[model samples]
Target: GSCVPVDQPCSLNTQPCCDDATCTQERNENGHTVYYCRA
Candidate 1:
């Protein structure tokens, strides 16, 4: 599996963040939920 770096886009079911990062959720301008890898 490939690890997603911090500040990069990711998906909880597919692309996961690196060990040192966390999968974070945020709302976009269109009110859509976006996922990203964060420290």
Candidate 2:
């Protein structure tokens, strides 16, 4: 029912979401709840 904050994980192939590290609530293309990174 609510959104949660999460920390970015370290992926070997990818160096994480270098752009934005914070995890926050956001809406998907289908208007579903999701987490997104903010720059």
Candidate 3:
């Protein structure tokens, strides 16, 4: 299975991030909610 790298897009249920990384949500430049992997 492919894992999401740091700073890359990810999801909570389906597309999860790699080990030692967390899936976090934040507002982007367009003021839209985005989920990304953070260490």
Best by TM-score: 3
Q: Tell me the tens digit of each residue's lDDT in model 3 across 1-39.
A: 688998887888866678778899987879999998998
Provide the lowest-lDDT 10-residue window in model 1.
14-23
TM-scores, all models, native as reference: 0.66, 0.45, 0.68
- Tens digits of per-residue lDDT for model 2, 1-39: 222223433333433344545555677779977665544
Segments of candidate 1 deviating more than 4 angstroms: 29-31
Over 4 Å off in model 3, which ranges? Answer: none
In candidate 1, how many Å is residue 15 off? 3.6
lDDT of each: 0.83, 0.48, 0.83
Q: What's model 3's lDDT at 37?
A: 92
Tens digits of lDDT, candidate 1, 1-39: 688988887888976788788889987678999998887
Ranking by lDDT: 1, 3, 2
True-vs-predicted CA distance for residue 11, candidate 2, Å: 13
